[PDB]
Design a protein around this ligand. Structure first.
Ligand SMILES: [K+]
Ligand SMILES: [K+]
Lengths: 660, 660
């Protein structure tokens, strides 16, 4: 979804000087000056910007009020028009320009920008100049300014006293340019010429899958027909063949209206390029469909046609596992057809009309009951058994089993099997390479976890760690792997750019920025800066976050669970579900001593922001800092010591005063 | 083991205002104010805390001494009671509350906390207000304060002059709430309703293993019975079948009382959820046990039942190796039954009552002696050989051996073998993928060590390192791998949180913190800070720790071995087993020059703390620093130079003075 607006203008402009300017703002500031205008006015792209789009910076002592007021009028109410004006220049050279102001609309018509293409007009207007010594200077300037117009612009029929081919020639062209140069400032989708099919839409996927199914059908049924010679059932076989041929011819026709991915870019919806690519690349697939052994053998290239697109159907995983079986079952059938052809060529030696006793069909006939009889030689084994018995041998020879009850024994079957045993070995090797790689990839996820467990267990057993810490660590590892199985936030957020990483971080800490008063009057540009520093810890029962002597250097927000603040072995605070605890960092500038042990009572979730990062963010946006200071009150400040007196001490003091 | 206390209170409270407060401390400071109390009193969770739990901050000019003294009394001796009081508010609005003070006990009864649930009472009491202009304000306030009580609290039979349904309704309810809201402030274990079986306890493991054994037995013995038709021995076969069926029915019944692990949490001991899950998921296993070929074929799903739990029996290692054999031996038996059924269907062609000569049972009968006889056709091969001969063929066809003395030859055995050779190939591929991955995982530990040895050897051979350093490095690598085989402290301690890492580090350096006077008066919060910085080195004989010019910047504690401090090629100190050597860092602030070579005499163990870390820790806890300075005396200070005179120099001087 591109917002291509600066490309539609230039490619239909042919070296213009368009001067897009903002329309909603008063005085219509210029927003983009084309390089063409950088030479037609002598101004660089440093002072045309932020000035009025009405071209009020090119005025002087010669501009007339016949159109300037009209220019302001046509800018007031949004309407295209074709005024003409006399303007000065950076070098103080008065020349005439042909204004072509025209509005440009948004997704919903709002007139956002004002296209203001200029055009030099000096030959076609009466020269006027004041600071000139001789009258030939302006006449020379006529040709000097309009050099491009002397060749192709307005020289179709060059002569004198023909100004009428200059005023009305493009007077009303602005409406004729409504489709040429007046695009829509919209988030456009990939646009295509009429009757062009995109390769990404949800229509070509169904055709791709249908072509895959039909290619498998043809690969299965063509060698069988050209090897096991069968007649035509007409109503159930001829119809299917004709329908498949028509479907593939329609596919060839529709292949002229696809969109190929560019070699160094994205979709190229140019019909000429598509046709050139199809001419250069793939009439091999056109030959096969259009109009015997040879015809079907060349029809078999349709499988190569469907294998060309082996990128949308296939992924690296279970898809390869399915493909490696679907191709094995096809090789075992092609070889089963070739083997039957070889074993049927040599049975009846037609030179002398005798049966060869060292073939494989005759010995199969001897071990199945049905013999061969002489009438010509009559039939032997049935046609429904000559295929099972011929796929059996191929399947034994490809899986390296080799029962050897059907074996090559004449002279040529031994020549064919030598070739079979090479392609079978190669296929077997490729299959057992691919399956090993696929299984390694699949199970590589649960190998790191077990390796980590083994390393931790060996570490805890080698150094004789006590049972308590050993079991605690062993439980912690399992707990962390039970909710973050393989996924690590650091690496995933490392491969993302600076923009969306902030959005992901803001989303992750959505339960501290929403349900907490402090993060209420906060700019988005500051939330995206705080959310990067917010970490997260997953406490467990009995775990201590701050001990009795550690330095409090992190503000913690509890989002799920409960904590216990114990001081002098006395409970003094029970935090839970939306209570902040820590130290006031912005107003103290000194690290403190945690005067109380914070111990978890339930599986807790805390979001921690370090002292340094919080101070750095609060030292930059010194507008949110005041709201943060005045809106965040800590439920348990771990710097102030709470002094109290247990009842036991009071009772002891009373007893002591009772004694004396 | 969770300490869930704040969850039991709320879920049986139904929007209360409980005000847990400490009991041991005098004046009973509040420890946790519920959000419900944040609106019934106008106070936020910033000033109710640390104040008295007797609600002494909500007093004023209208509180009566009829119960305040009684409130202090009931707080003195720990006993629940149900006083009622008139209290003020943050907005100075006097309203009546119903106190429900009740103590809460620890693991051993100690009365730790005081539950003080409040309840607004304004409609049910006579209004009293002083700073009011009109008498209708208090009457309106009656309804304003008690808005929740007008719907469901005390409006079962709403009428007038019915205050008796408000005093005695909940006067003694505190004892009736002893099981409702008065939990135990204990480290609780997972609690379950009566007659509920946990899936983690040591009882369900035995049932799981018994079910596994019985499923293997059924998988072995069902296809044999439904294929090799055998009669009933009654006393030894029917009894086992009935017992197994009863055991599995009992298992189905007991499956209603299990605890499934939550999708996003831990154990869910809710009977309704368990029943809903079992209804939604696994009556496929219920169908099979309850009430021929089809019945046993559907009984075979019990193997799928036991395969559902394939997470507790199995790990990634030798367990998979055992499973891949136990499933191969089962596939080779299921196919051995199917093959015998196929080969027994076609032997006797009952249409014409003749033996088919191209089967596999007849040819087996011809190659074993026993023929088939006609009486109907009488018996042939024995029943104890028809299974061995049928498992032989399957085992040859699955291991890709294929002796081919029993081979498929009729019409259908060739159709069955084509299907066998696909499942066998798939099983073989999966087995040889899993075994390769398992062996790679197992031997990946001893590959890094050999790679390190090879790299070190090649480095020492390429650069022509002298023999001395080469042998020393080669011995050092082996020595380090002989006690730290694969385990590295850095990575193992990297995946642990900040809490237990300190405990592990303290445990590792247990021989410097225990047997040394300096680390005697040290807080735990400082030991956990020093132990993180203590490194460890493993010296070897002849190794030098400090040379004659290096900068002493590390305090070293010897924990095992002996050292030698040589100065001017003279022994001046022999450290060993509990002697510290280094430089006084805290009182000098200048790096020095090691004026003596420290050389190891035996395989030593030193624990080293760097200068910067020691200074940083000693600059924070400026209470342990004084004890460290006054209690640590170095046995060999490597900054002061010991000046002496060898006897050789004295003898030379005496000889020189003798000459002249
Ligand atoms: K093999
Ligand atoms: K073989």
């Amino acid at each position: 979804p591109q917002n291509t607006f600066l490309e539609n203008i230039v490619r239909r402009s042919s070296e213009s000087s368009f001067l897009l300017g903002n329309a909603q703002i008063v005085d219509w500031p210029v927003v983009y000056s084309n390089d063409g205008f950088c030479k037609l006015s002598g101004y660089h792209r440093a002072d045309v910007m932020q000035k009025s789009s009405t071209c009020s910076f090119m005025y002087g002592e010669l501009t007339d009020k016949k159109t300037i007021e009209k220019v302001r009028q046509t800018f007031d109410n949004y309407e295209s028009n074709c005024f003409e004006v006399l303007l000065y220049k950076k070098n103080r050279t008065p020349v005439w320009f042909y204004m072509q102001i025209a509005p440009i609309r948004n997704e919903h018509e709002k007139v956002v920008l004002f296209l203001c293409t200029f055009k030099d007009i000096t030959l076609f207007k009466q020269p006027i100049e004041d600071d000139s010594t001789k009258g030939w200077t302006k006449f020379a300037r006529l040709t000097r300014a309009l050099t491009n117009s002397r060749s192709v612009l307005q020289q179709l029929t060059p002569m004198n006293k023909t100004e009428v081919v200059h005023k009305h020639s493009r007077l009303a062209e602005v409406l004729q340019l409504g489709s040429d140069i007046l695009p829509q400032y919209k988030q456009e989708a990939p646009k295509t010429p009429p009757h062009i099919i995109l390769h990404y839409c949800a229509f070509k996927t169904t055709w791709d899958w249908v072509i895959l199914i039909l290619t498998f059908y043809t690969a299965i049924m063509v060698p069988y027909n050209v090897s096991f010679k069968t007649k035509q059932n007409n109503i159930a076989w001829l119809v299917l063949d004709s329908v498949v041929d028509v479907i593939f011819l329609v596919d060839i026709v529709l292949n002229f209206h696809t969109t190929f991915v560019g070699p160094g870019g994205e979709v190229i919806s140019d019909p000429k390029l598509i046709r050139m690519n199809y001419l250069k690349t793939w009439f091999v697939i056109d030959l096969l469909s259009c109009l015997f052994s040879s015809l079907k053998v060349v029809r078999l290239l349709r499988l190569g046609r469907v294998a060309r697109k082996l990128d949308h159907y296939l992924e690296y995983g279970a898809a390869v596992l399915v493909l490696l079986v679907c191709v094995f079952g096809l090789v075992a059938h092609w070889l089963a057809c070739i083997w039957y052809s070889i074993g049927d060529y040599e049975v009846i030696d037609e030179v002398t009309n005798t049966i060869q006793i060292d073939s494989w069909l005759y010995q199969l006939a001897l071990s199945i009951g049905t013999p061969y009889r002489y009438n010509i030689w009559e039939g032997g084994p049935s046609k429904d058994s000559l295929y099972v018995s011929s796929l059996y041998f191929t399947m034994t020879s490809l899986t390296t089993i080799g029962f050897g009850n059907i074996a090559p024994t004449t002279d040529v079957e031994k020549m064919f099997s030598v070739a079979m045993m090479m392609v079978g070995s190669l296929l077997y090797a490729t299959i057992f390479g691919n399956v090993t790689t696929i299984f390694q990839q699949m199970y590589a996820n649960t190998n790191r976890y077990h390796e980590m467990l083994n390393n931790v267990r060996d570490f805890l057993k080698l150094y004789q760690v006590p049972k308590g810490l050993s079991e605690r660590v062993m439980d912690y590892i399992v707990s962390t792997w039970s909710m973050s199985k393989g996924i690590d936030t650091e690496k995933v957020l490392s491969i993302c750019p600076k923009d969306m990483r902030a959005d992901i971080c803001v989303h992750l800490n959505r339960k501290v920025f929403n349900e907490h008063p402090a993060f209420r009057l906060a700019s988005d540009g500051c939330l995206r800066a705080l959310a990067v520093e917010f970490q997260t810890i997953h406490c467990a029962p009995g775990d201590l976050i701050y001990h009795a002597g550690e330095s409090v250097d992190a503000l913690c927000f509890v989002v799920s669970g409960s904590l216990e603040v114990i001081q002098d072995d006395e409970v003094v605070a029970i935090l839970g579900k939306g209570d902040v605890f820590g130290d006031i960092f912005w107003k103290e500038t000194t690290l403190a001593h945690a005067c109380a042990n914070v111990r978890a009572l339930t599986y807790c979730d805390l979001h921690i922001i370090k002292r340094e990062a919080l101070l750095k963010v609060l030292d930059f946006y010194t507008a949110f800092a005041n709201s943060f200071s005045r809106n965040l009150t800590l439920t348990c400040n771990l710097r102030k010591r709470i002094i109290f007196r247990k009842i036991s001490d009071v009772k002891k003091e009373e007893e002591e005063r009772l004694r004396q």
